[PDB]
């Protein structure tokens, strides 16, 4: 099966600490804070402000195409931008201007950059146009600050920020 736009899904990632292994879900709640935040899955204890449309995947080019002309269902393919919608809110995963990573959360207004990923697979191969099978991990990197989807630990728990470096994240319907 392939990914494709207008398609519900969830991003997981796996993340290990004291040799205790976990997968754990992007989520985000509908309004108070906007930052994203991460559930442990085993089914994440709440499904429904997981779930996120793949609502646009555009090539690179036209989206700048698109945008610079703004200044005066699908198969996603990797290389390509992509939007996503968080299912709950109407609101769009987005890379945020406060804080060497930034963070991640939800904002409304999807002109500009800071709403829209590419995607890139996990190996050494740009695979550049290829179909994005489910399955597939993917590395996921802000349009905006070319900073990388990313999960990070703090003190005692597990966040997503937007970093220097990559997190490969598994993107499927659900």
């Given at each position: 099966?392939?990914?494709?736009?207008?398609?519900?899904?969830?991003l997981q990632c796996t993340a290990t600490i004291?040799?205790?292994?976990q997968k754990l879900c992007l989520?985000?709640?509908?309004?108070?804070?906007?930052?994203c935040?991460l559930?442990?899955?085993?089914?994440?204890?709440?499904?429904?402000?997981?779930?996120?449309?793949?609502?646009?995947?555009?090539?690179?080019?036209?989206?700048?195409?698109?945008?610079?002309?703004?200044?005066?269902?699908?198969?996603?393919?990797?290389?390509?931008?992509?939007?996503?919608?968080?299912?709950?809110?109407?609101?769009?995963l987005?890379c945020?201007?406060?804080?060497?990573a930034?963070?991640v959360?939800?904002?409304?207004?999807?002109?500009?950059?800071?709403?829209?990923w590419?995607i890139h697979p996990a190996?050494?191969?740009?695979?550049?146009?290829?179909?994005?099978?489910?399955?597939?991990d993917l590395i996921l990197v802000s349009?905006?600050?070319?900073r990388y989807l990313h999960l990070s630990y703090?003190?005692?728990?597990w966040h997503v920020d937007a970093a220097f470096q990559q997190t490969l994240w598994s993107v499927?319907?659900?």
């Open positions: 099966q392939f990914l494709r736009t207008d398609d519900e899904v969830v004291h040799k205790e292994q989520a985000a709640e509908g309004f108070g804070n906007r930052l935040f559930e442990s899955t085993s089914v994440p204890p709440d499904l429904s402000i997981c779930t996120f449309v793949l609502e646009q995947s555009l090539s690179v080019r036209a989206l700048q195409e698109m945008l610079a002309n703004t200044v005066e269902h699908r198969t996603l393919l990797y290389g390509h931008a992509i939007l996503l919608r968080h299912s709950y809110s109407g609101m769009y987005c945020l201007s406060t804080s060497l930034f963070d959360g939800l904002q409304e207004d999807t002109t500009g950059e800071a709403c829209w590419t190996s050494k191969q740009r695979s550049e146009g290829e179909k994005v099978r489910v399955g597939d349009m905006s600050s070319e703090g003190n005692s728990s499927a319907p659900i």
